């Protein structure tokens, strides 16, 4: 799964 | 949504360097600054980001004891310290708001980018 | 890490032609629960810092002309530009927010026959 953290500018909503 | 870095420097090997980042036309404690540098005829290589509100930061695996990433929240500034420069780490350093993917917006932007030279 | 493989390293083409630009992912960066794909294509021009063309694999940002268009899904992923114009000369990358850390391609050198 992806990983909110790698860039938190990154709304995945 | 601007982000205007410091110029280009030299730095012997085993020196340091603080390249600056001055962001502006935004909400500077709403997202993370992420630092990203450009070698010779090499691809980009993600650095590492800091919160510019809170402060916390997240550093790559090669970059881990020699780079600190801050911030100053007053000046909406940036900054990216490497130390003990080697003979690799010439390079352009941008930093960059890299996809800003909110409800509200999108956006993207990189610093003009700043050359430093390891040299004696 | 996520190793993001562009092919071809350059293409040249005439003015007004196709271009097709590929990009590999070494794992799916796909997360099926919002079916959305973490990746992103940059343009830049020498002197130029990178400039994002496309977010979510296929959502063309704001103000980029509609002649780029990304599709893909998983780890297959393709750059289109329709139709050539003379400044769309310059290197394009690909790029994961999938996983820390973010990495990029090694770019896609676009020059044009004349």
């Known amino acids: 799964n992806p990983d909110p953290n790698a860039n938190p500018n990154v709304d995945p909503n | 949504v601007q982000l205007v870095q410091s110029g280009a420097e030299v730095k012997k090997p085993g020196a340091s360097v603080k390249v600056s980042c001055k962001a502006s036309?935004?909400?500077?404690?709403?997202?993370?600054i992420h630092w990203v540098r450009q070698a010779p005829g090499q691809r980009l290589e993600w650095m590492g980001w800091?919160?510019?509100?809170?402060?916390?930061?997240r550093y790559s695996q090669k970059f881990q004891d020699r780079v600190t990433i801050t911030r100053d929240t007053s000046t909406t500034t940036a900054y990216m310290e490497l130390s003990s420069l080697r003979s690799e780490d010439t390079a352009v350093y941008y930093c960059?708001?890299?996809?800003?993917?909110?409800?509200?917006?999108?956006?993207?932007?990189w610093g003009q980018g700043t050359m430093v030279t390891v040299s004696s | 890490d996520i190793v993001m493989t562009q092919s071809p390293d350059s293409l040249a083409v005439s003015l007004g032609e196709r271009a097709t630009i590929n990009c590999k992912s070494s794992?799916?960066?796909?997360?099926?629960?919002?079916?959305?794909?973490?990746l992103a294509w940059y343009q830049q021009k020498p002197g130029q810092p990178p400039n994002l063309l496309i977010y979510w694999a296929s959502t063309r940002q704001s103000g980029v002309p509609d002649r780029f268009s990304g599709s893909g899904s998983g780890t297959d992923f393709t750059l289109t530009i329709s139709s050539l114009q003379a400044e769309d000369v310059a290197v394009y990358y690909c790029h994961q927010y999938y996983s820390s850390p973010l990495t990029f391609g090694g770019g896609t050198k676009v020059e044009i026959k004349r």
């Open positions: 036309g935004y909400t500077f404690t709403s997202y993370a």
């Open positions: 800091i919160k510019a509100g809170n402060g916390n930061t």
């Open positions: 960059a708001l890299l996809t800003v993917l909110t409800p509200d917006d999108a956006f993207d932007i």
């Open positions: 794992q799916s960066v796909l997360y099926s629960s919002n079916n959305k794909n973490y």
